[PDB]
Design a binder for this molecule. Structure first.
Ligand code: SF4
Ligand code: CL
Length: 407
């Protein structure tokens, strides 16, 4: 039985069936924008809440937004980056690589096992949300994890392999049981005569198990990498980080970069560290610093983004050669990123991924910058359950490790 079949079988049990499990779903933004295409419509032609209604009609007990999981990843990865920076300023190495793309993680383990220590220990948004629901939410609702099935809808054909990593288990209890792609889900709806464009607005569930809505605030973060950078930057400097604009790197396909200059906040420990101490296949060059005549030092964070895997191999070679100098690097296996993932609908439109990206968020939400640490649902989870980012409980549920040679 395929994972689609297993999931549908669980949903086929009447809710009052004594062998019926609690079945929940989480949905990626890239799925939400592309699912309209499965009906021959434009990206974003169906609303987030129409999709939530559609999923509920399949028999899902809870319907979650993967963006809640991404708030968790931003919390942990922003903290991890800042921690690595602090340790390096006072003399888990740098540069740091993101860890959300399983295509990258597979290549890392098989082809670059020596780079393992440089990779973020964070789990992906979907795996963080799944770990959370089978632990925190299970406890809150008085439901045994064994009686819980979680499904995720992803634009990606590699997300099941991510979910299947052996140790992503609960206390064979899987944190995330089944991954379904955008097109597979689109097919499920069409086969059941569900037309998403004709559905009423439904509603999301909060993974916290109380209140209404998806448990994510209004607005956009700019994505996990930018938001992790913002978390670190704003704590370091005491000043806001605007939306980033990445620029194409000359002579290297699929690579974009930005340099972020950071002056420590006055009176901060960061200011102290820079002053008090002025003096590995990828050796950190001690970082790119700057100073002024009066002694106001700063560091420039050198950030790169690679799409996709061939292009990433060429970046790594340059990095190892010392020809490319970066402090924080995001590698995505797909040329267009997740909106162009292998589980997405096929279009004759060469610019379909541009249309999908543009429709990801409305102009209203686009104009409002969201910060994960300000989300009351996230605050409550840390305050009452997780403890501190990077802490013992957070590490146990939300972090992971890598296996040289692969799994
Ligand atoms: S970039 Fe592609 S392979 Fe990587 S997580 Fe996104 S959809 Fe999956
Ligand atoms: Cl994810």
């Amino acid at each position: 039985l395929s994972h689609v079949q297993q999931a549908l079988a669980e949903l086929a049990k009447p809710k009052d069936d004594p062998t019926r499990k609690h079945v929940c779903v989480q949905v990626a933004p890239a799925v939400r924008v592309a699912i309209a295409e499965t009906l021959g419509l434009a990206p974003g032609a169906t609303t987030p809440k129409q999709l939530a209604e559609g999923l509920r009609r399949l028999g899902f007990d809870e319907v979650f937004d993967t963006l809640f999981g991404a708030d968790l990843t931003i919390m942990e990865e922003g903290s991890e980056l800042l921690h690595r920076l602090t340790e390096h300023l006072e003399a888990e190495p740098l540069p740091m690589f993101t860890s959300c793309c399983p295509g990258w993680i597979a290549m890392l383990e098989k082809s670059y096992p020596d780079l393992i220590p440089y990779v973020s220990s964070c789990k992906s948004p979907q795996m963080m949300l799944a770990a959370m629901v089978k632990s925190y939410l299970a406890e809150k609702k008085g439901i045994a994890p064994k009686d819980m099935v979680m499904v995720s809808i992803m634009p990606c054909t590699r997300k099941q392999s991510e979910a299947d990593r052996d140790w992503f288990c609960v206390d064979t209890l899987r944190q995330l049981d089944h991954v379904i792609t955008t097109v597979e889900l689109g097919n499920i709806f069409k086969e059941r005569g569900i037309n998403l464009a004709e559905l009423p607005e439904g509603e999301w569930d909060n993974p916290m198990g109380v209140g209404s809505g998806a448990g994510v605030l209004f607005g956009t973060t700019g994505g996990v990498m930018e938001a992790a950078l913002r978390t670190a930057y704003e704590l370091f400097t005491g000043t806001p980080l605007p939306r980033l604009s990445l620029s194409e790197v000359r002579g290297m396909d699929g690579i974009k970069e930005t340099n972020i200059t950071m002056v420590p906040a006055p009176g901060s420990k960061f200011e102290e560290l820079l002053k008090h101490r002025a003096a590995g296949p990828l050796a950190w060059d001690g970082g790119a610093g700057f100073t002024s005549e009066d002694g106001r030092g700063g560091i420039t964070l050198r950030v790169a983004v690679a799409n996709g895997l061939g292009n990433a191999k060429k970046l790594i070679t340059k990095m190892q050669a010392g020809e490319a100098k970066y402090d924080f690097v995001e590698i995505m296996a797909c040329p267009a990123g997740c909106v162009g993932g292998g589980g997405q609908p096929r279009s004759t439109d060469k610019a379909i991924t541009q249309k999908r990206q543009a429709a990801l968020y409305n102009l209203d939400e686009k104009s409002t910058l969201r910060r994960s640490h300000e989300n009351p649902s996230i605050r409550e989870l840390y305050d009452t359950y997780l403890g501190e980012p990077l802490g013992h409980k957070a590490h146990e549920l939300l972090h992971t490790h890598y296996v040289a040679g692969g799994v």
